[PDB]
Design a protein around this ligand. Structure first.
Ligand SMILES: CS[C@@H](CCCc1c(N)nc(N)[nH]c1=O)c1ccc(C(=O)N[C@@H](CCC(=O)O)C(=O)O)cc1
Length: 205
């Protein structure tokens, strides 16, 4: 499966995703990284890895749908099968999300449905949970909604700060974002017509 990663900044987990695709039995290759912002770190990451990049500036388009249509055209041109979001900070239109339903994934640094929105690590600390984690899900029109693919629980430790908790959750993200991508890329996990996750046994052995 040919994979695009959409970013707006540092491309968190992009290196993890790249490294996973260079593994022997990988079902995925990262074929393009698209940013809505020029000269961000995540583009340098991609370029240093020899992966094509594009920059699409939302300010050049009349509205969100036209901007998203421009992203989609690039995805079309590069024959992309699957999209991962890695810190992409523009809300994608309903038509875009619909088109890519079951083929676009993202990650969140909580065990959803807990700690929706931004600053989930601070939310976890402020609330006083002892277990948090991260969640990879299919992207839906509504932020943080969408069917869950993989989750990993991560302990909150006595004395944790936003930074130390964040670093622990990031290590889990480095594990599950690529594992989830592999599941979707291989076809092992597919989104059913009923809108629920399906774990498929593949014909090819
Ligand atoms: C806080 S992390 C992220 C996750 C969004 C992944 C996502 C997505 N990008 N689009 C859709 N439809 N659904 C999604 O789940 C997020 C990204 C952007 C916003 C948001 O309000 N963005 C604003 C502008 C943000 C900016 O670029 O400054 C907008 O697009 O108008 C809110 C949340």
């Amino acid at each position: 499966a040919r994979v695009a990663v959409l970013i707006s900044g540092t491309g968190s987990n992009l290196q993890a995703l790249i490294d996973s695709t260079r593994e022997p039995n990988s079902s995925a290759q990262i074929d393009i990284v698209i940013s809505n912002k020029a000269a961000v770190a995540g583009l340098d990451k991609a370029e240093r890895a020899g992966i094509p990049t594009r920059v699409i500036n939302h300010k050049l388009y009349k509205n969100r749908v036209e901007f998203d249509s421009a992203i989609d055209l690039v995805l079309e041109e590069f024959s992309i099968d699957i999209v991962c979001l890695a810190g992409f900070m523009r809300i994608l239109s309903g038509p875009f999300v619909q088109k890519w339903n079951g083929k676009m994934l993202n990650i969140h640094p909580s065990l959803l449905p807990s700690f929706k929105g931004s600053n989930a690590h601070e939310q976890a600390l402020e609330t006083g949970v002892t277990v948090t984690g991260c969640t990879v899900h299919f992207v839906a029109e509504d932020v943080d909604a969408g069917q869950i693919i993989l989750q990993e629980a991560v302990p909150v430790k006595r004395g944790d700060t936003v930074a130390t908790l964040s670093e622990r959750v990031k290590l889990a993200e480095h594990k599950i974002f690529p594992a989830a991508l592999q599941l979707v890329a291989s076809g092992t996990v597919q989104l059913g017509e009923n809108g629920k996750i399906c774990w498929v046994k593949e014909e090819h052995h």
